[PDB]
Design an enzyme around this catalytic site. Structure first.
Site, PDB file in Angstrom:
ATOM      1  N   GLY A   1      74.881   8.841  98.421  1.00  0.00           N
ATOM      2  CA  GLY A   1      73.967   7.937  97.745  1.00  0.00           C
ATOM      3  C   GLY A   1      74.437   6.514  97.997  1.00  0.00           C
ATOM      4  O   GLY A   1      74.206   5.612  97.190  1.00  0.00           O
TER       5      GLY A   1
ATOM      6  N   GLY B   1      72.336   3.399  97.204  1.00  0.00           N
ATOM      7  CA  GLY B   1      71.839   3.177  95.857  1.00  0.00           C
ATOM      8  C   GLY B   1      72.665   2.140  95.126  1.00  0.00           C
ATOM      9  O   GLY B   1      73.671   1.667  95.654  1.00  0.00           O
TER      10      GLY B   1
ATOM     11  N   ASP C   1      74.849   2.244  92.502  1.00  0.00           N
ATOM     12  CA  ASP C   1      76.263   2.576  92.364  1.00  0.00           C
ATOM     13  C   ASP C   1      77.003   2.701  93.690  1.00  0.00           C
ATOM     14  O   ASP C   1      78.132   2.221  93.836  1.00  0.00           O
ATOM     15  CB  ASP C   1      76.430   3.870  91.564  1.00  0.00           C
ATOM     16  CG  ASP C   1      75.998   3.720  90.114  1.00  0.00           C
ATOM     17  OD1 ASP C   1      75.619   2.599  89.704  1.00  0.00           O
ATOM     18  OD2 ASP C   1      76.040   4.727  89.377  1.00  0.00           O
TER      19      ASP C   1
ATOM     20  N   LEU D   1      72.826  17.005 100.826  1.00  0.00           N
ATOM     21  CA  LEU D   1      73.391  17.904  99.822  1.00  0.00           C
ATOM     22  C   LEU D   1      72.832  19.323  99.821  1.00  0.00           C
ATOM     23  O   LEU D   1      73.375  20.206  99.159  1.00  0.00           O
ATOM     24  CB  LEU D   1      73.239  17.296  98.425  1.00  0.00           C
ATOM     25  CG  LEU D   1      74.440  16.497  97.883  1.00  0.00           C
ATOM     26  CD1 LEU D   1      74.830  15.392  98.845  1.00  0.00           C
ATOM     27  CD2 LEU D   1      74.082  15.908  96.532  1.00  0.00           C
TER      28      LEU D   1
ATOM     29  N   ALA E   1      74.769  10.542  94.755  1.00  0.00           N
ATOM     30  CA  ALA E   1      73.382  10.720  95.185  1.00  0.00           C
ATOM     31  C   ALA E   1      72.456  11.194  94.064  1.00  0.00           C
ATOM     32  O   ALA E   1      72.473  10.661  92.953  1.00  0.00           O
ATOM     33  CB  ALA E   1      73.336  11.711  96.325  1.00  0.00           C
TER      34      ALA E   1
ATOM     35  N   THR F   1      75.881  12.272  83.705  1.00  0.00           N
ATOM     36  CA  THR F   1      75.097  11.278  82.972  1.00  0.00           C
ATOM     37  C   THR F   1      74.958  11.533  81.473  1.00  0.00           C
ATOM     38  O   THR F   1      75.042  12.669  81.009  1.00  0.00           O
ATOM     39  CB  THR F   1      73.671  11.187  83.577  1.00  0.00           C
ATOM     40  OG1 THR F   1      72.844  10.338  82.771  1.00  0.00           O
ATOM     41  CG2 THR F   1      73.039  12.575  83.652  1.00  0.00           C
TER      42      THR F   1
ATOM     43  N   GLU G   1      72.492  11.658  80.031  1.00  0.00           N
ATOM     44  CA  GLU G   1      71.284  12.449  79.861  1.00  0.00           C
ATOM     45  C   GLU G   1      71.634  13.862  79.425  1.00  0.00           C
ATOM     46  O   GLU G   1      70.806  14.563  78.853  1.00  0.00           O
ATOM     47  CB  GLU G   1      70.486  12.502  81.164  1.00  0.00           C
ATOM     48  CG  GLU G   1      69.573  11.308  81.376  1.00  0.00           C
ATOM     49  CD  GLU G   1      68.480  11.220  80.319  1.00  0.00           C
ATOM     50  OE1 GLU G   1      67.536  12.038  80.363  1.00  0.00           O
ATOM     51  OE2 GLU G   1      68.571  10.337  79.437  1.00  0.00           O
TER      52      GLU G   1
ATOM     53  N   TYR H   1      66.427  18.027  85.074  1.00  0.00           N
ATOM     54  CA  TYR H   1      67.421  17.102  85.609  1.00  0.00           C
ATOM     55  C   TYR H   1      68.696  17.146  84.759  1.00  0.00           C
ATOM     56  O   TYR H   1      69.804  17.264  85.290  1.00  0.00           O
ATOM     57  CB  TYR H   1      66.869  15.683  85.624  1.00  0.00           C
ATOM     58  CG  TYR H   1      67.916  14.619  85.833  1.00  0.00           C
ATOM     59  CD1 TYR H   1      68.375  14.296  87.113  1.00  0.00           C
ATOM     60  CD2 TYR H   1      68.441  13.920  84.744  1.00  0.00           C
ATOM     61  CE1 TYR H   1      69.330  13.291  87.301  1.00  0.00           C
ATOM     62  CE2 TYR H   1      69.394  12.922  84.918  1.00  0.00           C
ATOM     63  CZ  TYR H   1      69.832  12.608  86.194  1.00  0.00           C
ATOM     64  OH  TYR H   1      70.752  11.593  86.351  1.00  0.00           O
TER      65      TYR H   1
ATOM     66  N   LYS I   1      72.385  18.627  85.989  1.00  0.00           N
ATOM     67  CA  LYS I   1      73.560  17.765  85.878  1.00  0.00           C
ATOM     68  C   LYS I   1      74.632  18.437  85.013  1.00  0.00           C
ATOM     69  O   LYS I   1      75.833  18.295  85.253  1.00  0.00           O
ATOM     70  CB  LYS I   1      73.164  16.417  85.266  1.00  0.00           C
ATOM     71  CG  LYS I   1      72.525  15.429  86.244  1.00  0.00           C
ATOM     72  CD  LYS I   1      73.530  15.004  87.309  1.00  0.00           C
ATOM     73  CE  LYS I   1      73.006  13.877  88.183  1.00  0.00           C
ATOM     74  NZ  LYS I   1      74.023  13.517  89.201  1.00  0.00           N
TER      75      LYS I   1
ATOM     76  N   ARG J   1      69.524  -2.611  90.544  1.00  0.00           N
ATOM     77  CA  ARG J   1      68.839  -1.531  89.851  1.00  0.00           C
ATOM     78  C   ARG J   1      67.457  -1.355  90.478  1.00  0.00           C
ATOM     79  O   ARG J   1      66.878  -2.313  90.995  1.00  0.00           O
ATOM     80  CB  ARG J   1      68.709  -1.886  88.368  1.00  0.00           C
ATOM     81  CG  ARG J   1      68.166  -0.786  87.466  1.00  0.00           C
ATOM     82  CD  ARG J   1      69.050   0.458  87.447  1.00  0.00           C
ATOM     83  NE  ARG J   1      69.099   1.054  86.111  1.00  0.00           N
ATOM     84  CZ  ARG J   1      69.400   2.325  85.859  1.00  0.00           C
ATOM     85  NH1 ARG J   1      69.678   3.148  86.858  1.00  0.00           N
ATOM     86  NH2 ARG J   1      69.428   2.771  84.608  1.00  0.00           N
TER      87      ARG J   1
END
Ligand SMILES: NC(=O)C1=CN([C@@H]2O[C@H](COP(=O)(O)OP(=O)(O)OC[C@H]3O[C@@H](n4cnc5c(N)ncnc54)[C@H](OP(=O)(O)O)[C@@H]3O)[C@@H](O)[C@H]2O)C=CC1
Ligand SMILES: Nc1nc2c(ncn2[C@@H]2O[C@H](COP(=O)(O)OP(=O)(O)O)[C@@H](O)[C@H]2O)c(=O)[nH]1
Lengths: 333, 338, 332, 332
Positions: free
Chosen positions: B8, B11, B13, B59, B81, B125, B127, B149, B153, B184
């Site tokens: 990733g 992106g 990060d 991946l 990613a 995350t 999340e 998601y 994770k 972002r």
């Protein structure tokens, strides 16, 4: 007359569940990718076998379209923890992604279908509470456990997000005469029976102090059916709430088998002597003897006993007797 | 010289982590699914585009991952990613699991097999907390995912823990809460707000349509969060850490502070879904809440307690919420002035 | 003793290949009890292991564990009819499955010899008669299409990574190990029973169907031959000639003591045993399909030139081997 | 009004098709970033196209999409279209460019059969050409996982036409460039390069095989062909090309001229170097780094059938194309 679809139809639970549903007048479709179990239960000719592989999505979709089931019980899996350390990815594809594949297939072709996910106490892994309930935090300790936890949560998410009737049974150890030889309970009763018939000399085990919450499989698949017959879907821990040592099991089984075993020695050098012959029936091997596990897995099923009216009807002794009897009979023939 | 492999890379990060490790003398290899002619824009905007070796590693392709580890022989691998979209995960649940859950196990398994002494960082995350079981949330708060998601994770986090505990591999799981930056993605409320006000001030845009202006969020500064990732990886023993600011702010506050920086004296006229943002400066309407995004008051408060990060990694939020809002608004006002 | 890995071990070909490989000193690993292995007496000599073509990682570890010198991909969802209903599943096994194996070898043991089992089904709407390696393909079913991918991805791994990857385009081959669902076994097996009262009559389909039928043991040998060449190549393995379902029923019936006389036509055709003046063979609307316009017959000359392979069993001997075998089975 | 669903909406062909179909009054729905829709922006249609999330790998997702959109026409222009990446990710490439086609067809068969369907096939399927020029009748010979996967998409599309009686077309399009062409391809590379080399933002231009003769056309005209065959009373396959070839070398020469450069091809082989016969500074090198595993030498198609049945033919000239691309990049 409802239609039920059982994955893992060839296993202990699929077999017994098939038996139960047939008695209640269901049409039973066993998903498979002849079975000695359905045959031993005398129902191999009433269970409609159809193809389905949790490793691929399109075939599942079509299977639901053709079978149009009212209830789907996903008892299929790669359930060996050990194997999971060697084949973690394959294990994840079946025990985790495979669960989602079915849910997504039901969401897509028949959303009114009831879904049961076969979860495990293995998800509590490094137990965060004793005993364990539906509120005990999870802590998987093997790829198998982590895949199962995935299956659990993805089942809860589909229930909450699509309001689907999706249940998750967090079941603890349950045995029966149909239990695999790979398992300690069956190994003990199978071995003891053979010994009583000279087909074998000694029973070789591991730590005789190991503790487990052991139940009678038939009563457990009954809890699966019970969950599925409720107005609202929910998850339940199903277990006995008491633990026993491998020694209690050997000891009680040897007793039923006719032996008069009397333990002597301790640790790796423990032994069981048949005070009827004077020979050593059981002994411990370094090959199996592992470190005494500090984590104790024992479930508190009061929620299930409460809401479902479910409750074990077989005592630990009755279970031990059932299995030893069945294996004394098998070895004779 | 040390060498890092970042998934990733292109992106938010990935770009900051690359910039940070480059500054530390690292050799940085990266991989990102998003290719094209504007894809490496974050790398261009930080000026490290020609200092990062870009390779192809998806991946979902195990054999590709294995070859990559063999060829690159990394010392540190940061899995940053993912198809990190809660919304889309409901529409593509299996693909989401194949990338964010199984993709984690594919990297770990190829590491165990090709170069088992490789450090691994998994981008978990907040999340995963979903329906928060404790407020605030710490590494000890029971997880409760509310989307494919989040659930995937969760697998990615636990599979990472298991490899650390079972194979004694140096594997870390960073449970990061929202962290913003000028890099972002526009999709997020923060860039949406600043990028919109910037287009409004310069007449390129009409109004700013948002959801519930009462939504509380724990926003941190991205650059500081990737720094926490590197910190975790430099510890004697691997572990998992909650990385957050520990305090929340409403989407409203973000709009206000940002509005000013852009030349607007916002006054909030309305209630909830009827609430509107009128700039007294010109009596015009700049912000209004569309029922298209609105979501009733959330009972779950996502707010992290990063005290453990402070104790072991000596990490804590440095930049302030006002500094963050300001950094972002300035970056987009500047982007619009071109 | 070289090490070989066979997918689809429980099938007719897998069973015979394992027997051939064992006689030559190989260590045989079969990916999946099987009545065929037991009937050849090699059940205890074939090391059975797990491998699933629908998932990639399990294949990788299997290769890393077996370190085979030769891999024979004989496994597949080989039913045209079923493939129309399960096209995607078919593709995943017959098309992507082949690539999964090849990709595993390429990643973990590139010097592994690989044989892909292709079929004449890829000729579908035959573009030439007879068909050779140079005949343009024209698949007529998801199954054939998938196998075509299997064939080309195999050619590409040979030409791109310079791997020893072969693809044998095999035509119909029979034996006493053929399943009862296949015309040839159904014929012999049925006739045997009818000869011993166990059954009344044989019900088939269009007796005019023409086929290129060979003897399986000779076909799996061509497989091994292909794998022993200096260079890897693709070959058409067939007899070069064809016979009707009628010739087969007839020749076999004569071995079973009958003396069939054909009366009727198309769906109303029937065979009568003069010896006993009775109707034994009959056609039904259930199994009847129009005479295929696509004449499928292979010209195996390239196999002769480079492998020195050719059929060494006559159609008559093939019918005899099967009829005799099923007569003995019915007796015992 | 007509409703079309296009995959690969943000790609080159996807964008142009959106423009053209909008121009014909269609409701356009596309499936597929902060700058991703840069192509839609460049053709200023970014706000006339409704975007929906559908990934060629998520079958259930594809079904819900047909179900939600109810398209009249479906153009599948999405893909992992990099011959190079193809070798590094062969399985993923197959799942998307081969099976992905089947998932759409199958989703259309069960959700809305009357939907017209277009498969974006390619001349890469001819690989090592078996005829020159190549036509709909030239046997295919794929040289990469990309080609093989596409070959499956072609045959699977053909089979759904012949077996299920669906309106399914397979456009075998030869290379076609435009200003929206991806920077990965040689053409957009050369033009995106010179607008840099001759602008002090770079040194020279390194290329691989400067001999690969390529049939190059103008993207906008080729997507016209797709719409055309989809409008025919009967579905069928067509070859779409200029029927004219030009080597990569020949392209650079002209492409550089529009920026100020006079080639000086000195040295045959990896030692080939092109210097500017003006400022006496070498501006073009070479390197094995860009030599593919299984290269496809010559590719030239005979769009004769497209002419007779669709009336389609190439307009823009090779030079007109080089100019078009070279300018849009000089500007950027
Ligand atoms: N037994 C216990 O005490 C406990 C069990 N459980 C769980 O309960 C479930 C049932 O238990 P039990 O019967 O003992 O377990 P089994 O191990 O017997 O069940 C495995 C079954 O899954 C089938 N299967 C494997 N892979 C696939 C696939 N890809 N697609 C379809 N079917 C497949 C197997 O068939 P095949 O023979 O073809 O491989 C087999 O019938 C399991 O999921 C287990 O993890 C949970 C807690 C305790
Ligand atoms: N991508 C690329 N192709 C090159 C280069 N030099 C020569 N080629 C050749 O140019 C031809 C066309 O390449 P490309 O435009 O990428 O299209 P494709 O071959 O259809 O994928 C191929 O035969 C390449 O081998 C180079 O630097 N880059």
């Amino acid at each position: 007359g409802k239609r039920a679809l059982i994955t893992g139809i060839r296993g202990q639970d699929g077999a017994y569940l098939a038996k139960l549903l047939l008695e209640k007048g269901y049409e039973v479709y066993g998903a498979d990718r002849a079975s000695w179990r359905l045959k031993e239960l005398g129902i191999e000719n009433d269970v409609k076998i159809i193809h389905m592989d949790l490793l691929e999505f399109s075939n599942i979709i079509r299977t639901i379209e053709k079978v149009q089931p009212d209830e789907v019980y996903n008892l299929a899996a790669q359930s060996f923890v050990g194997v999971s350390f060697e084949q973690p990815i394959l294990t994840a594809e079946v025990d985790a992604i495979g669960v989602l594949r079915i849910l997504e297939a039901l969401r897509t072709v028949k959303p009114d279908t009831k879904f049961y996910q076969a979860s495990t106490s293995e998800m509590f892994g490094k137990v965060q509470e004793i005993p364990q309930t539906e509120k005990t935090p999870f802590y998987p300790r093997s790829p198998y456990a982590v895949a199962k936890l995935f299956g659990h949560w993805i089942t809860v998410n589909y229930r909450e997000a699509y309001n689907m009737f999706a249940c998750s049974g967090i079941l603890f150890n349950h045995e029966s005469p149909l239990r695999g030889i790979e398992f300690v309970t069956r190994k003990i009763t199978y071995s003891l029976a053979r010994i009583k018939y000279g087909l074998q000399d000694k029973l070789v085990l591991g730590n005789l102090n190991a503790k487990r919450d052991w139940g009678y499989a038939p009563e457990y698949v009954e809890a699966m059916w019970l969950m599925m017959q409720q107005p609202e879907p929910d998850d339940y821990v199903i277990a006995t709430g008491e633990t026993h040592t491998v020694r209690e099991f050997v000891e009680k089984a040897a007793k039923i088998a006719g032996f008069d075993i009397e333990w002597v020695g301790e640790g790796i050098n423990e032994k069981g002597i048949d005070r009827n012959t004077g020979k050593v029936i059981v002994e411990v091997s370094e090959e199996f003897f592992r470190p005494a596990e500090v984590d104790i897995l024992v479930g508190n099923p009061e929620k299930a006993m409460k809401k479902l009216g479910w409750k074990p009807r077989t005592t630990f002794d009755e279970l031990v007797e059932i299995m030893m009897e069945a294996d004394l009979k098998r070895v004779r023939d």
